[PDB]
Every structure is written in C-alpha cells, then in structure tokens.
C-alpha cells in the first residue's frame, strides 16, 4: 500500500514485470508494461517511477488530446487480477498527470477524485456506490460461424445444467474477492446467457476501480472457456437487456444523512433533495450513464423499463427505487445506467446531480407507486411524469445544455465526450442497417 | 376509352380476364381479377361492372379501414403492361368508392383527383408533373447467396459491356410508350447497377398512373433476366441513393403562369409564390415524399444532397432547382422525393404547398447560387438556410403540425399515414441493428 | 444442522461459496450464490444470514408475484453440492421463502407442505410419509439427425449390460444421494429403451420432497458428464412406456400405523378406507397437480396398465390406487397417477389434504376392483360406477378450479397462480400447429 510494502513485495516475489493501468474517456482500460531491472539500481529506478510517475504519449488515447504522465495510486497495487497465480507480474491503477505535475483535466479517474475531494473538503461528505452490472456470455452460432448467440438457455436464478456459467460466476467473484474488490451475490439473469454480479456498497472510487477490473477479468475468464463476454446493453432483440443498477447514498460528518426516523418514509430532507436533483438532471445524466446508440434499445417503453423520471418505494417502472433498508443501509437506486458506461464519469454525474439538488434544497415529487407503463399518456401528463431521451443524440443535446454536469465533468471531458459521441451518432444515422434492407429492399 | 370502345375491344380480342387495379395508402399497387363470361349475358354483366363498379372487401388494404367498391377509370383501359402480347387479358386503373356511391375519403388516387378538380373548378388551373425516378438492379452475391449486390459495375451514362441493362431500359421504355405512358430519356446512373427513367412532363394524375405502372413493369422485366429491381432510396452505403426529382408547374387559364418576360429571371410572381409555398412546408412535405426510414440515409449532408431548404437557378445543393427553359417550358424541380413515395400523395402535397404560397402571395427568399454544403454553419444561419428533418420521425411530427397538408390529404389519409408510419418507426427504433452489433458487441 | 455445526464445517473446509436454493411454483429449482467473506467478520456476516435470511428479488420467479423477498434456510439440508461432492469449497442449503415481515410467503411451495404437515401434527399428532418411484429416460442425439433425441440404449426391464447401458449412472446417482442422507432403495432399467427408475425411501413427506428435487438436478448433471441427457418428460416417445412416479404413502396418528387393523377385512383399518375414499373422491382434481403437463395425459390414456380408472385394489395394475401386501408398520397405499414432472411439494400437499378430507368426513370407500378395468366393457364400468381421470390438462385444471379442498390446502396464491399459468400453458398448445396435423392434413 505504501512504497516500502510495494518494494518488499517486489523483492520477495521476484516481480519481473510491472503494469501501469489507466482508462480512456470512454472507459476502455489501457496499460503500459515495463520490466523491473534486477539489482540495487533497478529497485531504485522503480522507486523513482512509483513516486514521481512515468512518461507516455497520450496522443492516441481517446479523449486525451502531447507528452503526459501516469501517477500510480499505490492503494491499488496487487497481483494481476486475470493472472493471480503469476507472481512475477504486478499492476497498479494510475491517475493521469501532465508534464508539469498537475492532474490532467481530461482524466476520467482524476475527475471522480476531484468531485469526491471537493465533497470531502467542503462538507466532510462521503459518497458510496454499489453497482449491479449485468452481462451476456456468448458462443458462436453453429449454423452461422460469423455470428454469436447466447451461451445457454438458462433463466433467472436457474440451476445447472440449464445454467452453464456457475463456475464462471464463481471464478470472477473469487478473483475479485481475493484482491480486495468486494462483491456480493451473483446469479443467472432472466435472458439466456445473461448473468449478474452484485458489487459491494463501497467508496465510489474503489467501486469504479472494481468495475473496470471486473469487466476485463470476466472477458479473459470467458475466453478460457471458449466464450465471449459482452457488456452491450441490448445485444438481442426479444430478450432483456443488460443494465447496471447503481445503489448510492451520501454521508455527512460520518452520519447516514439519508435516514430520518421522524420523516416521511424515514427519508431525510437531504435524501429528497438528492432524489430531486437526480430527477431534475436525468435527461442529461443518461448521455453519460447510457452512452451508446444501443443503450436506448434497452431504454424503451416496457413493463419494467427505467424510462419514466420518477421515484417510488417499491415500483420498478420508475427510474429511481428506494430499498426498504433504513439506518446505515438507507440508499437510493438509480436504475437507468447500463454497463457500457465509463464508471468514473457515471459516478461523477450522479453525485453532482444529487448534490445540486442538496445545494438548492430542491423539493421532490410524490413517489409513483402505480405502474407508469400501464397508465395512459393523459395520466402521465397529469402526474407530470416525463421520460428520458429516446436516442443517444437526444441525450447528448440535453447534456450539452446542462451546466451542472459540464462543471462536474470539466470543460475538456465535457467537450471531448460530446464530440466523440456526436461522431458516433453520425456514423449510425448515415449507415444502411439490416432492418432497412429487410423492410425496404422489396419496395 | 369509352364503354363501347372497351366492349368492342373485348369482342375483337376475346378478352377472357379483366384486372381492376388500385393502390393502398403506401403506394403498393393492388388488383382483383375476374373472368369475362362468354355470350350476350357476359358482355352485359361486364357493362354493369365497368359503369357501376364492383364490390370488394378492403379491410385488409393498408389505410382502408368494410364493404367497398372500385370504379374503373376507362381512360386507363389497355393491354397488360407487363404482358402486352397477351391480348386475352386486360386491366384498368380504378378509383375507390363506398357502398353508397361516393369517392372513398382514404383513396390516394381520389385524393389527387379532388385537389386537381378543385384547382380546375376554382381557378381554371392545370397541374403538370414530370418525375425522374431512379432505381437499382440487383443480383445475388455469389459468395453470400442470402444477400444482394448491384447488377453491374457501370457508371453514369456508361456504355456496354460495363452497362449491363441497356436492353432492360429499352424494354421498360418500349412497354410504357406502347401503352401511352410517355417517357423521355433513360441512362445508367452514377452508382453501380443504378439507372434512371425520365417521365414526360404531363398531367399529374396521368403521371401518377405512369409511375405506378412503371414500378411494377420494371420489376417483372428484371425478374425475366434473373434480377431484382428495388426502389429503396439508399440500398448501399458508400454509393449514391435513388431519388425521384419532380419537375412541376401550374397553368392558369391555359397560360404558363410561371413565365413573365418582364420579371426577375423571367419568373412570374405566381411562380415565386409557388416556390415560397414549397419552401415554407418542405419539412412536412418530405414525410410524404420521403416516407421511409431509409429515405433519410439519402437525405444526409453532402456535396449534392437536397437537404437545404432553398432555391437556385443552377445550384444543385438546394432543394429546388429552376431549369433554364422558359415560355411553355418554365418549371421548377423539387429534388427531395425518392421513388419509395406514393405518387398520388406526393403530387397532392406539392400542389397544396405551392398553391398555399400562391393563395397567400408569399415572398420568396433570394436564390442561393453558392454551395450550401461547403459554407459553414454560421453562413447558413446568417442566410437563414434551414435543413429538412434528419429522420422519418422528425418529419412525421412536422406533418402532424401542418394544417395545409392535413386539409390537402384529408383527415382519413392524414391520420392513417401518421399511425402506420409511427408504428413503422417504433419497429426500427426498438430493433437491434447490425451497425450496433459491429460497434458494441466487443465492449 | 445447528448454526454452530454449519459454521465449523465452513471454517475447517474453507468454504468460499454458499448457495441459497429454493423452488418455483412449477417445481423448477432456483438458487443464488454469495461468496463467504474471510476472517471472523465474514463468519459473523455469515451467521446473520443463516439465522435471519437473505433478501432476494423474486419478481422474475414464476408464481412469486412486491418484489422484495427473503430466503430463510432449513439448516437440516446443509451439505456440499450433491452434484459436485468433491468440491468442498462450495456448499448449499435448501430454504423457505419469507416476506419482508419475517413471515412465510404464501406462494412458497415448500412452505405450503410444511404448513399442512404442521397442522396435521398439532391437531391430530399425525406424521405423513411418502415413498416415490420416479422414472426417467436417458437420451442421446440421433446419429442420423442431430436435432432429434432418441433413447440412450435399447435395453428393457431389469436388463443387464451390455443391453443395459446405464448401471454405472444409476449407481452414481444412488451413491450421490445416499452419501448425503437423501435415502434411496432399488434402481433398475425400466421397460422402455433408455428408461430407468430410482426407488426412494419411505420417509417424511417433506424430506422426500427435498430428495426428489435434488435427485432431478443430480441425475441431469451426471447424464451430461456422460454425453447424455436425462428427462422427466412423462411420455417423450410414442409407442413405448411413459415415465411415472408411483407414490407410496401413509399417515401415522399418535405414533401408531393408523392404516393397520388386524381384525378388519384385508387387514386394513377404517382410517385407511376413509383416506382412500378421499384420494378417490378428489382424484380428478389431484391429477392437475400430480400431472401438470399437456404431455402427462399422453401417459394417462386408456391402456392395460394405465392408472386412469378411479378405483383401488389390492393387486390390480389398472387401478389408480394399489395397496401393497405389506402389513403392520409397512401398511401403505400406492397412488399410481403421478408422474415426475409434478412439483413434489404441491403433489404431496394435495394428496394429504384429499386423504385427510376423507378421514375427517368418514367417507365410505367403494369395493376393490380386482378385475382388469380396461378389459371390461364401457357398460361394465358404468355398472360398477368406475369413472376415469380427466383426458387432458385443461379438463384437469377445470376440476381443480372447482375443488375447495385443494384450494384450502394449496392456499389462494398458489391455487390461482398455478391455474393462471397452466391455462396459459394450455392456451399455447391448443393454438399451435402440431406435426401430427401437418402429417395428417397437408395432403387434403
């Protein structure tokens, strides 16, 4: 955890290779690997890089445009998650700094650190997130070796042999637990080949490091079994999509500020302010937490689709759900994000939107216990239940007009993300899709 | 042309089968075929149907929802266009009436007839259209027998052997000419396997009957050669799409009202009113003249894309172009429609928009001779050059808010088209497209 | 079995993963696995889950329609995974479903049996024992067509190897169940090709239901390890025997074999007769639960040994009830209608309630029918007042809808959900175009 422990770990295990890992604006993990020179000089050359960082050319890193630096966060040093037995190699997650020595403004990781460091300095506040990313395991179609189909025909909570991934789920969980990245339950999900890994309600930065570690590890584990793991939100029409429900709460002065014994639903005012802030900015949040064209194939009207901007105690058709846990466990659950989002940026925008509600003491609308999807469009207009954007472009324009989220992400991230994702949308809207060929070639 | 001529044609050629043809709301042609009974009784049973129509169940005709009637328009009686040699069979284009005996309000053909009959009664005005539909000839992919590719690698105006459809173009033109449906030039177009057939500047109803006849005939001709003809607007990304440039003008009291010797560009005030009316309603017109999701893959920013709402004398980047012909040939050319549109409805909405400009003497903006696609977005905002909708849904909402076009199409057509095409869009936006799988399965 | 014993087993075996297992309304097993945290903290985090339960989302569990629910484990079922006994790092426990309020969920099939078994114990001091005989087919891909499945061997009843190609599979499923307390008895190749049968111990009805649930999963995993597939489909192949689950059962009042009377005819007590009259009086409604599939009724068709005729006998195989010759502590009745596709928790529940409904009301039983019911004409059956079970799934559901006894026993939630789900199941079959129809009618 400190420099010495790291070095003594190197000297004890003959660590011959070190990996410095970071993430691009879109959440794709990146790393550079250098060797550990043997002998006195080598252990000191390693000390100089662990404390002062190393240089690298980030001109080809999406969202990073020049000479830059990576700065190890030594609290993340551990054995390679996908190669725990291999002790000769180690890795550490890094923040991105500039040549001068300041945190680079476009670093997704540094972005989450800043907002949590400002929330810690100014209000002695903590921010905890507990995500529930879903994914699909895939194999090739025996009839069409150029396509992929679900890995099994198992259902929700199913047992073997219908569930063909109990060992895979057992391995990804073991791999994360044995490294400190804590998780809770896991199970086969509704759709075929779909699964879920529930993460520990924990520090939002540690949890963002968790998610990034988990996405890479499940993929390598899957490949060992001749399969592929995808975090595509809606890989197949006609079956459930993959979401990442995010349970979150804030603490002020070591106190669960969301709990109030003598308040309605035992929820504090600060909680309602936080909920109101999430609902106020939802239409723009999803550009970050649902950042793909395919994301909005999951965000479509449905019996259980989190598209309606409202909160409820038990209703699942709402975009926010409040679990029954109270006291230290009081939390709110934002149900819209899918696992394709960059966790650092998603966690940033949910806190900023919630805090913006707290900073302005925003009033929260009545919880909608009725089913939003079944009620007609008039009842929705009456109740004032709006919906999230229908496509990625519609969400990008909501984000472009959100100053709360611009100040939260910063200019560089804000402007680069919009530019990269506007090009991503232009490519889609200009492409000739199969759906059209099926529909219109005969006319 | 009259009842007698038809009967004498039947008696001379031993016509044993008769086809009564009409069209649905989406322009798909439909027909029912009945036999001609031999002898005295049979020729009289035929007279009763030719003059009073025949019954039919239009509950399964898109946009027709009950017992209904078809009423032959005897000016369209001829030998089958796709079977000219076969004299035993004949056909006639029909209007749709109700059981009572009135023109059915949802008939696309009757819709165009009404607006032209009102323009003829109230202002002694004629309406002429000369379209230029493009299409693609297709063969199977030898490597993937489940896909289609262009029929040749010929270019614009190309000669054989690179042009592999000179005989096909020669046959479709002969077939239409030999039946009265007049056309002008034809040639291989820019894209591979693409072609164009230029229709005669003629009565807009006769021309709408022309187009419907042409689309069916080119398809059957293609099949004879082991190919397929498609009027899909953008069947292949990376090559030109298929449009239907519509040359149009109006005449008042037998006078070319678009020509004014002593006016700017020798264009009359009525012409500018008509142009202004087309530009004013363009955003809603394209929902009818570009009625598919794929239509807007052709309507995308480009060096020669007709997306910018403006007119010019020679500029091709504008949505309206004015040919150099003057006098009796003075006309304007709306460049946005693609051949997937229902000609009857398209011709209706262009006249209503143009006349609405005439009825209100609307001022026309300055012609934009500069290239609209090359100038930046500021110069466009300065010049006030707006763009047509980017997708089918955006266009449908413009049509939903256009009272000029609602009154032109009528309630039934207006409301059915929006309903059918809103469902068509919902299917697209909920489908998982190949583009997404290519882009997001690896994340 | 005790909270401590479980925790000691965890520490010594270094168990890193625990499985919470339950069942849905249709008898499909379900489970959730959570990692066992390291250190004394994880052991205490654990302990809290075993005594108090774990919250789970049951919105997507068939028959479990708020979404917040609890899994409260019955620690008497703790053990290694029966299908991975060598992997000590994993264990599982069967649970009951509770509500947020800490009360048994009224839609829990396991809890449904417990309720009726506890009521029978408190009010009459009665135990309920069931000994089932599930049958199953082992399948292998047809060499000529890959899509189709065919029997795994061409052996017959009681055959030996080589014709019997699964004495080692039958031996392993028995060894796996016996090694973990789920007691079983005989096993043998059945009549039809690739058909096999594992006889279970005559035991506590709830314990028996747990063994059945575990047996079904285990035999499927064993089969797959041999490149085969095991199925509990009642009639997978026309032209041969279907798979049934003969259920031997009996009740004991005040620790006495109440079914036994030395002085009464056939050495059968009045209580036995009242119980048989209760099973027979409600037979048509029971089979909706014990035979809950469309395919079940392709096994319940008139035949020499088809248990479709609502009657009982001491030896006849054509009756729906048979009384084995064993007397004394072994006096029991055998209900022949059920098949292994049923939910054993619900099956044993309705059988108990139907018999105790006869015991409560002192119903006079009919005379035993030793003559072959199928051999005799339709008038002879009408003369003897011998009625048949429903001929299809929908007819049985309608019988269940009109049976108050089985509504009280199953409870409202299960009762209505099962009827709503199975009516949809029948609606899907009746609207489909089967290959039988294509074969018969495409030429016309």
PDB file of N, CA and C in Angstrom, chain B residues 327-357:
ATOM      1  N   UNK B 327     -40.815  30.229 -71.251  1.00  0.00           N
ATOM      2  CA  UNK B 327     -42.004  30.108 -72.075  1.00  0.00           C
ATOM      3  C   UNK B 327     -42.883  28.978 -71.581  1.00  0.00           C
ATOM      4  N   UNK B 328     -43.317  28.130 -72.519  1.00  0.00           N
ATOM      5  CA  UNK B 328     -44.217  26.986 -72.204  1.00  0.00           C
ATOM      6  C   UNK B 328     -43.485  25.944 -71.346  1.00  0.00           C
ATOM      7  N   UNK B 329     -42.149  25.964 -71.354  1.00  0.00           N
ATOM      8  CA  UNK B 329     -41.368  25.015 -70.596  1.00  0.00           C
ATOM      9  C   UNK B 329     -40.930  25.471 -69.228  1.00  0.00           C
ATOM     10  N   UNK B 330     -41.321  26.670 -68.807  1.00  0.00           N
ATOM     11  CA  UNK B 330     -40.944  27.149 -67.485  1.00  0.00           C
ATOM     12  C   UNK B 330     -41.482  26.204 -66.417  1.00  0.00           C
ATOM     13  N   UNK B 331     -40.590  25.746 -65.534  1.00  0.00           N
ATOM     14  CA  UNK B 331     -40.993  24.788 -64.471  1.00  0.00           C
ATOM     15  C   UNK B 331     -39.997  24.902 -63.318  1.00  0.00           C
ATOM     16  N   UNK B 332     -40.346  24.296 -62.182  1.00  0.00           N
ATOM     17  CA  UNK B 332     -39.485  24.250 -61.010  1.00  0.00           C
ATOM     18  C   UNK B 332     -39.300  22.759 -60.761  1.00  0.00           C
ATOM     19  N   UNK B 333     -38.174  22.410 -60.130  1.00  0.00           N
ATOM     20  CA  UNK B 333     -37.857  20.978 -59.881  1.00  0.00           C
ATOM     21  C   UNK B 333     -37.553  20.718 -58.401  1.00  0.00           C
ATOM     22  N   UNK B 334     -38.486  20.058 -57.708  1.00  0.00           N
ATOM     23  CA  UNK B 334     -38.321  19.650 -56.316  1.00  0.00           C
ATOM     24  C   UNK B 334     -37.460  18.391 -56.289  1.00  0.00           C
ATOM     25  N   UNK B 335     -36.311  18.470 -55.620  1.00  0.00           N
ATOM     26  CA  UNK B 335     -35.267  17.460 -55.741  1.00  0.00           C
ATOM     27  C   UNK B 335     -35.218  16.481 -54.578  1.00  0.00           C
ATOM     28  N   UNK B 336     -36.133  16.587 -53.622  1.00  0.00           N
ATOM     29  CA  UNK B 336     -36.060  15.802 -52.399  1.00  0.00           C
ATOM     30  C   UNK B 336     -36.698  14.422 -52.509  1.00  0.00           C
ATOM     31  N   UNK B 337     -37.828  14.274 -53.200  1.00  0.00           N
ATOM     32  CA  UNK B 337     -38.527  12.982 -53.168  1.00  0.00           C
ATOM     33  C   UNK B 337     -37.667  11.843 -53.688  1.00  0.00           C
ATOM     34  N   UNK B 338     -37.909  10.660 -53.141  1.00  0.00           N
ATOM     35  CA  UNK B 338     -37.321   9.414 -53.596  1.00  0.00           C
ATOM     36  C   UNK B 338     -38.433   8.497 -54.090  1.00  0.00           C
ATOM     37  N   UNK B 339     -38.104   7.497 -54.911  1.00  0.00           N
ATOM     38  CA  UNK B 339     -39.159   6.727 -55.587  1.00  0.00           C
ATOM     39  C   UNK B 339     -39.937   5.791 -54.675  1.00  0.00           C
ATOM     40  N   UNK B 340     -39.665   5.768 -53.371  1.00  0.00           N
ATOM     41  CA  UNK B 340     -40.445   4.940 -52.461  1.00  0.00           C
ATOM     42  C   UNK B 340     -41.773   5.583 -52.082  1.00  0.00           C
ATOM     43  N   UNK B 341     -41.978   6.847 -52.432  1.00  0.00           N
ATOM     44  CA  UNK B 341     -43.177   7.565 -52.035  1.00  0.00           C
ATOM     45  C   UNK B 341     -44.367   7.148 -52.889  1.00  0.00           C
ATOM     46  N   UNK B 342     -45.563   7.311 -52.324  1.00  0.00           N
ATOM     47  CA  UNK B 342     -46.805   7.096 -53.054  1.00  0.00           C
ATOM     48  C   UNK B 342     -47.042   8.283 -53.979  1.00  0.00           C
ATOM     49  N   UNK B 343     -46.954   8.102 -55.304  1.00  0.00           N
ATOM     50  CA  UNK B 343     -47.001   9.282 -56.190  1.00  0.00           C
ATOM     51  C   UNK B 343     -48.256  10.126 -56.025  1.00  0.00           C
ATOM     52  N   UNK B 344     -49.422   9.497 -55.858  1.00  0.00           N
ATOM     53  CA  UNK B 344     -50.648  10.271 -55.709  1.00  0.00           C
ATOM     54  C   UNK B 344     -50.549  11.226 -54.527  1.00  0.00           C
ATOM     55  N   UNK B 345     -50.038  10.743 -53.393  1.00  0.00           N
ATOM     56  CA  UNK B 345     -49.963  11.584 -52.204  1.00  0.00           C
ATOM     57  C   UNK B 345     -48.872  12.639 -52.343  1.00  0.00           C
ATOM     58  N   UNK B 346     -47.722  12.266 -52.908  1.00  0.00           N
ATOM     59  CA  UNK B 346     -46.655  13.237 -53.124  1.00  0.00           C
ATOM     60  C   UNK B 346     -47.135  14.383 -54.006  1.00  0.00           C
ATOM     61  N   UNK B 347     -47.751  14.055 -55.142  1.00  0.00           N
ATOM     62  CA  UNK B 347     -48.232  15.095 -56.046  1.00  0.00           C
ATOM     63  C   UNK B 347     -49.279  15.974 -55.374  1.00  0.00           C
ATOM     64  N   UNK B 348     -50.064  15.407 -54.457  1.00  0.00           N
ATOM     65  CA  UNK B 348     -51.054  16.196 -53.733  1.00  0.00           C
ATOM     66  C   UNK B 348     -50.381  17.237 -52.844  1.00  0.00           C
ATOM     67  N   UNK B 349     -49.357  16.828 -52.093  1.00  0.00           N
ATOM     68  CA  UNK B 349     -48.787  17.719 -51.087  1.00  0.00           C
ATOM     69  C   UNK B 349     -47.921  18.803 -51.723  1.00  0.00           C
ATOM     70  N   UNK B 350     -47.323  18.533 -52.885  1.00  0.00           N
ATOM     71  CA  UNK B 350     -46.530  19.564 -53.547  1.00  0.00           C
ATOM     72  C   UNK B 350     -47.427  20.655 -54.121  1.00  0.00           C
ATOM     73  N   UNK B 351     -48.561  20.268 -54.706  1.00  0.00           N
ATOM     74  CA  UNK B 351     -49.503  21.255 -55.223  1.00  0.00           C
ATOM     75  C   UNK B 351     -50.085  22.094 -54.092  1.00  0.00           C
ATOM     76  N   UNK B 352     -50.533  21.440 -53.020  1.00  0.00           N
ATOM     77  CA  UNK B 352     -51.155  22.173 -51.922  1.00  0.00           C
ATOM     78  C   UNK B 352     -50.176  23.153 -51.291  1.00  0.00           C
ATOM     79  N   UNK B 353     -48.921  22.736 -51.118  1.00  0.00           N
ATOM     80  CA  UNK B 353     -47.921  23.635 -50.553  1.00  0.00           C
ATOM     81  C   UNK B 353     -47.629  24.793 -51.499  1.00  0.00           C
ATOM     82  N   UNK B 354     -47.505  24.507 -52.796  1.00  0.00           N
ATOM     83  CA  UNK B 354     -47.258  25.574 -53.751  1.00  0.00           C
ATOM     84  C   UNK B 354     -48.437  26.521 -53.867  1.00  0.00           C
ATOM     85  N   UNK B 355     -49.645  25.966 -53.983  1.00  0.00           N
ATOM     86  CA  UNK B 355     -50.832  26.807 -54.071  1.00  0.00           C
ATOM     87  C   UNK B 355     -51.024  27.618 -52.794  1.00  0.00           C
ATOM     88  N   UNK B 356     -50.790  27.003 -51.631  1.00  0.00           N
ATOM     89  CA  UNK B 356     -50.873  27.753 -50.384  1.00  0.00           C
ATOM     90  C   UNK B 356     -49.968  28.977 -50.429  1.00  0.00           C
ATOM     91  N   UNK B 357     -48.814  28.854 -51.084  1.00  0.00           N
ATOM     92  CA  UNK B 357     -47.968  30.019 -51.286  1.00  0.00           C
ATOM     93  C   UNK B 357     -48.597  31.018 -52.235  1.00  0.00           C
TER      94      UNK B 357
END
